[PDB]
Design a binder for this molecule. Structure first.
Ligand code: NKP
Lengths: 299, 232, 339, 59, 212
């Protein structure tokens, strides 16, 4: 019974619906509807428009699949939380938590895959329209294979059900060596994709300045270097806003025992699932054709 | 336009001999080649096959394992390797070119032949026409039959007719039982429906003497009918 | 002077030609065909799809056996297809990649092609060497070659952008006859079933009926607006149909000297790239730049189907001699068989 | 002076094209209709052919 | 057998697929000019009845110059088979002041075509040394009007000649226009075209990736 671990972990088992429990469930449910609907719109637009059949859009339709899954994985958890968490068994507890990790890992890994496709078709002297769909499908399966692996290892031994002494407090059945391992995975991913986007900006910037004497035609100039800095800031700023508080709690739970990390955990996880809702409006709003495609779908 | 084979000679049982055939005058890279042997007094017998690009290889059931056929396209040559030569391998070996697309005529050009002496299911294709005496200026018919029906679902009947003049390599007359090969006079015609086939000559000549063979191409263990001599 | 008199003479000749047509224009084909049964909705499906071309397909022709087919592309290659089994019989590499036309010999031993290189090349398909080699290059045109149609194994008719059409002798290799009289570049050509007359469309909204034996123009038809880029001959051999950039098709008759029916609708604004007829002459298929192909009731002008499924502008369109299939090529480098 | 010969040939060609035999448009329209009705049964596209005889569907 | 014919078809597909890689990295340049422009000498420094295509390679990138001759005067939509090219190279004689007005019209008709949209332009003002000798002894005000600069300064005249070409575009804000004052230098002519087509592709990738 999970009641054995929860009491040792300093947690609490709710028996009746509370004001916080009602507010968290209500505020998180309305988020889930948007995630499973906005990310479904991106799927249809790419399929119904023949002008979106290029490798870059297949990593954006895959990101919708990773984010749509992240809505179902939150729909399931919301039902089994509060006056319902005193009912799950050990086997059902590991399934409830394992669906969360398989969805968030797939979302973060798709953000890095987009940052490498752009870096590839920017330093190569070939048109992205004239590219093959072989590299994308290889990357797509690797994204989904690694996510499932990261969601199945804690259920096959990487947990504290056999080592009852040292494991986390936020997840009483997860070892503290798996929360640290997950924080390293995403922190490294952010650092890598910051470098990739900062090399694109510095490369196009030194070419716009060089082709200013000869090329007086309406290309380059400042509208080039201000519509490219805006995009980099939005894609990088949104990751920090929706994921920095989450990682701090993960490394505070393991490192600091005298920390009341149990109070912020229910809202720092909702804010991390809001990133799956801001993604379709960041990678699918610059395309005026995609916006025009949206209107022709909704009546 | 030229298919010269060489490498034969007297050999001992259990010894090894290698046959080489050199092509010159056509696009050898796009032709699938064959090896066909003929006993000193009996009819022809298909031996092996290598496709264009060396994709598929086929062997006779009597020589499988002991024989290997390979080609060297850049050098324009074809090879046959024999390791355990028995006393039943005394024959004359020919080389035949064949190309396969919609409307082609395979087995059109035969080599010249190299001799080999050793001092020591499948469709059964019949010909009960061992000898026939004729007179020039008349009309004759050569009959043939097969165990299985050679007519395929796609409407193609795979029966071929060959002519071996005295001391000459076989030449193609009719391919697919109704089509006349290029360079053959119009007096040669073929018929049949699915089992019994006949080749008809309208007016005979002095060069029509020889032995008429025939072949099936429905299943790759190819079999030839017995000879039919035009005694004249 | 005399040029003024000649202009006056030309002014009054056209009045008497129009009056002769107007007097005989007692009725219209639509009025007579107001009591025939409609053909209904034609439904065609993509049976086969021929993949392998690496660029836009500009021309395609059918063999008389109704099974083999040749096609050309901007890549600069010529491919012979087996439409039944989707098998590539041949693949002919060309010297120039700017090829805008291709033809199939009625006997089947030769193919022809040409384009912005101003010459037509003939390829021998039945050689003893097992390959395909060019037999003869036909030079003598000053503009780009826009169309060619084999007459016999030793005769071919070619039209060019230098405002002329010619008849050649392949054995000799010299221009036998030259057909003059057009004003704009000739874009199309259509041999009669009897192979004794042909018609050509030019970029001056004019179609002329020629005579190969006599080398003189017999008839002239007007009524279009923009360049005529597609012409076909009715199976009876007594009429023909045109298609122009002004998104309209018309049916002319060689005996009435008049247009009979007009094939246009308000939802089409793009031109017609290809025109073909049915074996019985009851259907009229036409390609468009709107990525689709349209089927028209030739006796009623009512649209009766859409051959959709191409991802770019439809360039080519042909019907087999037995009426069992329709092949269409387009700029997306695919051919499709419709039944 | 210069275009005199070209216009002289133009009217000569116009003279030949004007003096030709012509028929009524009603007669011509009936002829095209009579051809389409007679060959209706021989059109495997206007009247679809059964899948047994179809060479592009029998596989 | 019909199974041996299928192997022939699959052997052809292997040869066709070996050319797909080449055509996916191919850059086509359409070359235009005149008799006095210097198109003959320009191609003589390139180590390679209708169109004379010159296939070659720079820095492991396939190239192809579609050099039409006098046929470029054709003005039909059929002749515009070059809608798949990536750039257009134009050769102009700077010394010939009399024919500059003539050379300024054919430029206007081509670059304003509805087909050559999404295509960049490269300009090569040939024979700049002859222009240096022609100026400082012969004025350009006697040949052109609306010239407010000094007629005895090379930089003033050069800054005026390019502006005359740049003002004849009604579709400016879709693609750029590069200009170079080249000569019979014989060396940099291949490298200057390489940079212009490199940044043309780069500014096609930036919109296709939604990065700008
Ligand atoms: C606050 C967490 C920030 C982001 C989360 C990282 C995603 C998962 C990665 C690694 C494993 C961490 C597992 C513990 C993190 C918190 C998730 C969690 O399980 O929170 C508790 C919440 O269900 C409600 O608890 P109950 O009401 O007891 O079910």
């Amino acid at each position: 019974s999970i009641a054995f671990f929860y009491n040792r972990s300093g947690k609490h088992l709710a028996t009746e619906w509370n004001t916080v429990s009602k507010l968290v469930m209500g505020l998180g449910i309305t988020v889930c509807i948007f995630i499973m609907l906005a990310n479904l719109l991106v799927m249809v637009a790419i399929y119904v428009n023949r002008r979106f059949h290029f490798p870059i859009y297949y990593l954006m339709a895959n990101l919708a699949a990773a984010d749509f899954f992240a809505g179902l994985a939150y729909f399931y958890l919301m039902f089994n939380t509060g006056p319902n968490t005193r009912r799950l068994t050990v086997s059902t507890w590991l399934l409830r938590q394992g669906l969360i990790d398989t969805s968030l890992t797939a979302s973060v890994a798709n953000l890095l895959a987009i940052a490498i496709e752009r870096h590839i078709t920017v330093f190569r002297m070939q048109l992205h329209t004239r590219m093959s769909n072989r590299r994308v499908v290889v990357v797509i399966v690797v994204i989904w294979t690694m996510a499932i692996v990261m969601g199945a290892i804690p259920s096959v031994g990487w947990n504290c059900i056999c080592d009852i002494e040292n494991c986390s407090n936020m997840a009483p059945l997860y070892s503290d060596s798996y929360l640290v391992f997950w924080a390293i995975f995403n922190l490294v991913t952010f650092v890598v994709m910051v470098v990739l986007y900062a090399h694109i900006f510095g490369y196009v910037r030194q070419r716009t300045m060089r082709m200013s004497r000869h090329s007086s035609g309406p290309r380059r100039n400042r509208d080039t270097m201000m519509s490219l800095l805006k995009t980099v800031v939005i894609v990088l700023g949104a990751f920090i806003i929706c994921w920095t508080p989450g990682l701090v709690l993960l490394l505070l739970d393991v490192c600091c025992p005298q920390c009341d990390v149990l109070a912020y955990e229910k809202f720092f996880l909702l804010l991390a699932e809001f990133n799956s809702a801001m993604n379709p409006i960041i990678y699918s709003y610059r395309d005026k054709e995609m916006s025009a495609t949206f209107r022709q779908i909704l009546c | 336009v030229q298919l010269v084979e060489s490498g034969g000679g007297l050999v001992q049982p259990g010894g090894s001999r290698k046959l080489s055939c050199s092509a010159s005058g056509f696009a050898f890279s796009s032709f699938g080649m064959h090896w066909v042997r003929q006993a000193p007094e009996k009819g022809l017998e298909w031996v092996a096959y290598i496709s264009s690009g060396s994709g598929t290889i086929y062997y006779a059931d009597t020589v499988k394992g002991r024989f290997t056929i390979s080609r060297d396209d850049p050098k324009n040559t074809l090879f046959l390797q024999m390791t355990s030569l028995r006393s039943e391998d005394t024959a004359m070996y020919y080389c035949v070119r064949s190309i396969y697309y919609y409307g082609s005529s395979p087995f059109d050009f035969w080599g010249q032949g190299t001799t080999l002496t050793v001092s020591s299911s499948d469709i059964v294709m019949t010909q009960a026409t061992s000898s026939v005496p004729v007179t020039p200026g008349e009309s004759v018919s050569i009959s043939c039959r097969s165990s299985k029906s050679l007519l395929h679902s796609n409407g193609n009947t795979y029966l071929y007719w060959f002519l071996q003049r005295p001391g000459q390599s076989p030449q193609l007359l009719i391919y697919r039982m109704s089509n006349l090969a290029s360079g053959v006079p119009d007096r040669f015609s073929g018929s049949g429906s699915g089992t019994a086939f006949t080749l008809t000559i309208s007016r005979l000549e002095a060069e029509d003497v020889g032995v008429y063979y025939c072949m099936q191409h429905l299943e790759y263990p190819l079999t030839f009918g017995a000879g039919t001599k035009l005694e004249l | 002077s005399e040029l003024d008199q000649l202009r006056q003479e030309a002014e009054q000749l056209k009045n008497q030609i129009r009056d002769a047509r107007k007097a005989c224009a007692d009725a219209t084909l639509s009025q007579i065909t107001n009591n025939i049964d409609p053909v209904g909705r034609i439904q065609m499906r993509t049976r086969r799809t021929l993949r392998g071309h690496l660029a836009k397909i500009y021309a395609m022709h059918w063999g008389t056996d109704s099974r083999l087919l040749v096609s050309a592309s901007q890549d600069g290659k010529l491919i012979i297809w087996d439409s039944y089994t989707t098998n590539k019989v041949h693949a002919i590499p060309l010297r120039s990649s700017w090829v805008m036309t291709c033809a199939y010999a009625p006997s089947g031993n030769y193919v022809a092609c040409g384009g912005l290189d101003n010459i037509c090349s003939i390829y021998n398909l039945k050689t003893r060497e097992g390959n395909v080699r060019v037999s003869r290059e036909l030079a003598g045109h000053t503009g780009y070659l826009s169309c060619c149609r084999f007459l016999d194994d030793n005769q071919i008719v070619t039209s060019s952008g230098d405002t002329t059409c010619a008849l050649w002798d392949i054995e000799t290799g010299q221009q036998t006859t030259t057909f003059t009289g057009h004003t704009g570049d000739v874009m199309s050509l259509s041999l009669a079933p009897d192979t004794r007359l042909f018609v050509s469309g030019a970029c001056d909204a004019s179609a002329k009926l020629w005579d190969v034996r006599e080398g003189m123009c017999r008839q002239t038809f007007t009524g279009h607006e923009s360049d005529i880029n597609a012409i076909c001959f009715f199976p009876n051999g007594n009429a023909f149909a045109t298609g122009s950039d002004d998104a309209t098709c018309r049916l002319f008759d060689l005996r009435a000297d008049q247009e009979l029916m007009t094939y246009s609708h308000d939802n089409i604004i793009c031109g017609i790239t290809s025109v073909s007829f049915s074996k019985s002459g009851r259907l009229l298929l036409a390609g468009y730049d709107d990525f689709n192909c349209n089927v028209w009731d030739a006796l009623k002008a009512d649209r009766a189907g859409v051959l959709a499924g191409h991802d770019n502008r439809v360039s080519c369109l042909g019907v087999t001699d037995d009426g069992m299939a329709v092949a269409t090529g387009s700029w997306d480098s695919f051919l499709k068989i419709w039944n | 002076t210069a275009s005199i010969a070209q216009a002289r040939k133009l009217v000569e060609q116009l003279k030949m094209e004007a003096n030709i035999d012509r028929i009524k448009v009603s007669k011509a329209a009936a002829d095209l209709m009579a051809y389409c009705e007679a060959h209706a049964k021989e059109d495997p596209l206007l009247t679809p052919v059964p899948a047994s005889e179809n060479p592009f569907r029998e596989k | 057998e019909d199974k041996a014919a299928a192997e022939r078809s699959k052997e052809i597909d292997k040869c066709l697929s070996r050319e797909k890689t080449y055509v996916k990295r191919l850059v086509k340049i359409l070359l235009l000019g005149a008799d006095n422009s210097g198109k003959s000498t320009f191609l003589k420094q390139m180590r390679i009845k209708g169109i004379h295509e010159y296939d070659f390679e720079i820095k492991n990138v396939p190239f192809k110059m579609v050099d039409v001759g006098g046929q470029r005067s054709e003005r039909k939509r059929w002749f515009e088979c070059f809608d798949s090219v990536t750039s257009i190279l134009f050769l102009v004689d700077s010394s010939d002041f009399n024919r500059l007005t003539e050379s300024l019209n054919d430029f206007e008709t081509i670059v304003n075509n509805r087909v050559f949209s999404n295509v960049s332009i490269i300009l090569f003002l040939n024979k700049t040394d002859l222009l240096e000798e022609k100026v400082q002894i012969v004025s350009i005000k006697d040949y052109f009007l609306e010239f407010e600069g000094d007629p005895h300064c090379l930089r003033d005249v050069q800054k005026f000649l390019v502006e005359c070409f740049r003002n004849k575009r009604r579709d400016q804000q879709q693609k750029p226009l590069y200009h170079h004052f080249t000569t019979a230098i014989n060396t940099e002519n291949a490298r200057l075209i390489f940079r212009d087509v490199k940044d043309t592709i780069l500014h096609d990738n930036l919109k296709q990736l939604m990065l700008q």
